[model samples]
Target: WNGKGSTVDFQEIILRRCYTYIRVVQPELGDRDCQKIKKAFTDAFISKDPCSAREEDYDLLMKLGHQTVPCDKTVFWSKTKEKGLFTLENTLLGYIADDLSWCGKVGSSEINLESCPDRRNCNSNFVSVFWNLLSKRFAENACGMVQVFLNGSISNAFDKTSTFGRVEVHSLQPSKVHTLKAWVIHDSGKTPRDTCSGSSINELQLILRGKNIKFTCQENYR
Candidate 1:
């Protein structure tokens, strides 16, 4: 998570970085696109109840940042730190503020740039809803084969309650996907037997099978 305690970084550096990266990756994008993106992003949380923002509240983020990810290129992560892995480099809001935090003051017009609480403090805090919505769209649009990066070091690599497990997996379109490749990564050199066959992983496999998504589990996949 990049911003364990950041709010303005999203408005400042992260948003700036997002546009900078987009310009490098998508030079043809015009001022109008940029303008709409800024408005959509700001409008997402500003002047709204921070604790009331829902996954759908970020619809504009997905709409404006719509860039197709090539099949087998999309990587989902669970029980892992971002650590330069699977950052939503392409999505507009995803890159702008994946792990950052921000919230709107109930009566104020400014975005709080301090430590915004999670579900414990604010159930619908801006950060959590933003990721959930963007991630859902990301997985929903996944095509061909998809990949998941899991922590093999953990006893349960695929956590059912995780964002990837709860939202992204269910959002996957069966019609668009043919297979799921699980990459079980571990910290130490020793690979754990709990890779993809762990209880949680088996539960995930069953769900995928029921959804008609062919499942293939791999361990220590490079």
Candidate 2:
């Protein structure tokens, strides 16, 4: 079964977000061509199959919307739908698309408001592809000490299938990112399921080791 289509007024809504991001939220980013950004974004999927939209489709939009995240401030998370020190979702490009659903049809230029492929059913659907691309870019741009926030209450805190594992982790440049810190956070009063020594975390450390990046872990961090 398909899911509901793009949010109503997606273009205007995204443009508003773009302007807000550049003009108010992070004014340090300075002036940006918001209209061109909207064009590049829509051009990526409009008149195309939503299910066929590829990660590379958003290249132009990514270029136009790019912003710098200073070294040591990047944080990637999995199974933890939260927090800063600048996770991708808080960046300008991510901020604009956050919580918005959008897709396009092969024969229509208008945003599909009727039906779009469900994310679980379509591996390369428009929305998911865009987010994956964003995640990849965010990781690629990261420099200096980076961090990953894992949920200590979960068994597979660092699941290989997660975007953090599949996309962000691999995207990190060993030369650019000096250390990969894993902060395993657990809920108060809950017996933690995974810790720094857990197999799941060990797998993560091994991966980072293979990548020639330093790895460290801490449990129940403040």
Error of 1 at 198 (Å): 2.7
- Among all windows of ten consecutive residues in candidate 1, which has the lowest summed lDDT? 1-10
Which segments of candidate 2 are over 4 A away from where they belong?
A: 82-84
Question: How do all models score by TM-score?
Answer: 0.85, 0.95
Which residue segments of model 1 deviate by more than 4 Å? 1-6, 26-32, 82-90, 191-193
In candidate 2, what residue range of length 10 has the lowest lDDT sum? Answer: 76-85
Q: Top TM-score: which candidate number?
A: 2
Reference-based TM-score, model 1: 0.85
Q: What's the CA error at residue 34 for candidate 2, in Å?
A: 0.8
Per residue, candidate 2 scores C-alpha lDDT tens digits across 92-186 of: 99999999888888778698888788778798888888898899889998999999889998888999988988888999999899899999998
| Candidate models: Cα lDDT each | 0.72, 0.88
Clashing pairs in 1: none
Candidate 1, residues 154-185, lDDT tens digits: the string is 78888888888889899999999989888888
